[PDB]
Amino acid sequence: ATVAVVPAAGSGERLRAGRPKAFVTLGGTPLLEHALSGLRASGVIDRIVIAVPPALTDESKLVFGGEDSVIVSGGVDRTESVALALEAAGDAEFVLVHDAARALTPPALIARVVAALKEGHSAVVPGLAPADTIKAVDANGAVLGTPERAGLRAVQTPQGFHADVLRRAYARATAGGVTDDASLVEQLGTPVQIVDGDPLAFKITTPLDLVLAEAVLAHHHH
Amino acid sequence: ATVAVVPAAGSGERLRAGRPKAFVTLGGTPLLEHALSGLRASGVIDRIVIAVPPALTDESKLVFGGEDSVIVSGGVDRTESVALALEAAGDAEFVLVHDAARALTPPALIARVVAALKEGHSAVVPGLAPADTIKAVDANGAVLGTPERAGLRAVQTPQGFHADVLRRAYARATAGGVTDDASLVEQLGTPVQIVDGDPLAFKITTPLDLVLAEAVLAHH
Numbered sequence A: 001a002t003v004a005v006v007p008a009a010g011s012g013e014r015l016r017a018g019r020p021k022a023f024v025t026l027g028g029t030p031l032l033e034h035a036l037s038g039l040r041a042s043g044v045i046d047r048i049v050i051a052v053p054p055a056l057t058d059e060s061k062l063v064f065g066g067e068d069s070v071i072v073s074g075g076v077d078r079t080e081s082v083a084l085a086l087e088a089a090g091d092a093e094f095v096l097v098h099d100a101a102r103a104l105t106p107p108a109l110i111a112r113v114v115a116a117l118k119e120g121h122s123a124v125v126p127g128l129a130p131a132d133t134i135k136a137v138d139a140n141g142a143v144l145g146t147p148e149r150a151g152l153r154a155v156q157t158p159q160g161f162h163a164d165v166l167r168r169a170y171a172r173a174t175a176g177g178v179t180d181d182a183s184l185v186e187q188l189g190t191p192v193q194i195v196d197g198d199p200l201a202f203k204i205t206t207p208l209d210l211v212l213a214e215a216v217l218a219h220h221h222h
Numbered sequence B: 001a002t003v004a005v006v007p008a009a010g011s012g013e014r015l016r017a018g019r020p021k022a023f024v025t026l027g028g029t030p031l032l033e034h035a036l037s038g039l040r041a042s043g044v045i046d047r048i049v050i051a052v053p054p055a056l057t058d059e060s061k062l063v064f065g066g067e068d069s070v071i072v073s074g075g076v077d078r079t080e081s082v083a084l085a086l087e088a089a090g091d092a093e094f095v096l097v098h099d100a101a102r103a104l105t106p107p108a109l110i111a112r113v114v115a116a117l118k119e120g121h122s123a124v125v126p127g128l129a130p131a132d133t134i135k136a137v138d139a140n141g142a143v144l145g146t147p148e149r150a151g152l153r154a155v156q157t158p159q160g161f162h163a164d165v166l167r168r169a170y171a172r173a174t175a176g177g178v179t180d181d182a183s184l185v186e187q188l189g190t191p192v193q194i195v196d197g198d199p200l201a202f203k204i205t206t207p208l209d210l211v212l213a214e215a216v217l218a219h220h
Ligand SMILES: Nc1ccn([C@@H]2O[C@H](COP(=O)(O)O)[C@@H](O)[C@H]2O)c(=O)n1
Pocket: A007, A008, A009, A010, A011, A012, A013, A020, A021, A022, A051, A074, A075, A076, A077, A078, A081, A082, A099, A100, A101, A179
């Protein structure tokens, strides 16, 4: 079985007042609903576990629950939220962790992640070459160096794992600031394989992001 | 004094526009004109040198050419286009290299870059923390590492330089295929300083970028 875990249980940004980025509306619909639709339309996800703010567990069950979608109370950080979601994941072979702010992620991208895991990769991440040159900077903001742009990937979600590989990684070190699940797995040198991402799987968090997302909805739906 | 070199000689292939990308319109105005309007609005640019596709040089001169508004035939890639335009940079103590494709770049950012040069920095690049986590990968797509996102910058243009530093960097370039001017300066060992970028200085590269630029303008 393949389970998708969706941490939608809060925010470290004080501006947002504990409201997850996942609950922002897009075309009158929360980002989380768009993300769930993508996961379901991929046709490769058996169950989804969504971690939500504890106060909104009842509300989320009613709105986002279903035969393939389990709701759990989330944690104080993202790392705890994913950990709590993993409890309810059961005995899945594959676990995908998906950022619900990447609302317009195409279903095909999600299938690509699962397909690569079935080829035998333990850890799979969608990515694209960065549009801008990326530079390493020191604490001063002085350039340390410029890696080959073609040797870099801006990575997206869902990030896919063999379940035990992911659970072992989550078993150690809280350090809640982690947003990238593959990074946790990489601490032991576990191989991670990039598959093609998609420009549409951008994270929707800023006003400019939301402007782009609304514009995409217009082309797709109006 | 400050001269802006504007590489505008790129093709419209990725946009499928059937014309050079500089001459694709955004709310009815060519991208190049948006880029020039930003430079003019900043109030800190004394001279512009535009590299255009070589076949359009004569026509471009008729439209844009005049005192301190110089058109040169561009090159086979961005590196050659910049190198050609540098020949026309003139006496300015500071040179900015600004993609025509970053059409919505705010005048404020251009002013921020010039200010940092005037402050005494030899090379200045606008940058923002990457929106996504960045991973280094090998040729087969296997992950090599995930540098802390906080220690990375996704860089934009204009990139600003003391004129002598940029000329010396370009003199030492042995091949094209460079899209980042600061990378050539880094090869001299010259320190490069990052200043705040701006989300609106994104490069219009794909059809989706063009949708974004249109949607931004639609708001205003
Ligand atoms: N307590 C928390 C805090 C953040 N998160 C998740 O971590 C990610 C990053 O959140 P912020 O950048 O808003 O802090 C989001 O996907 C958010 O839903 C969570 O699931 N539980």
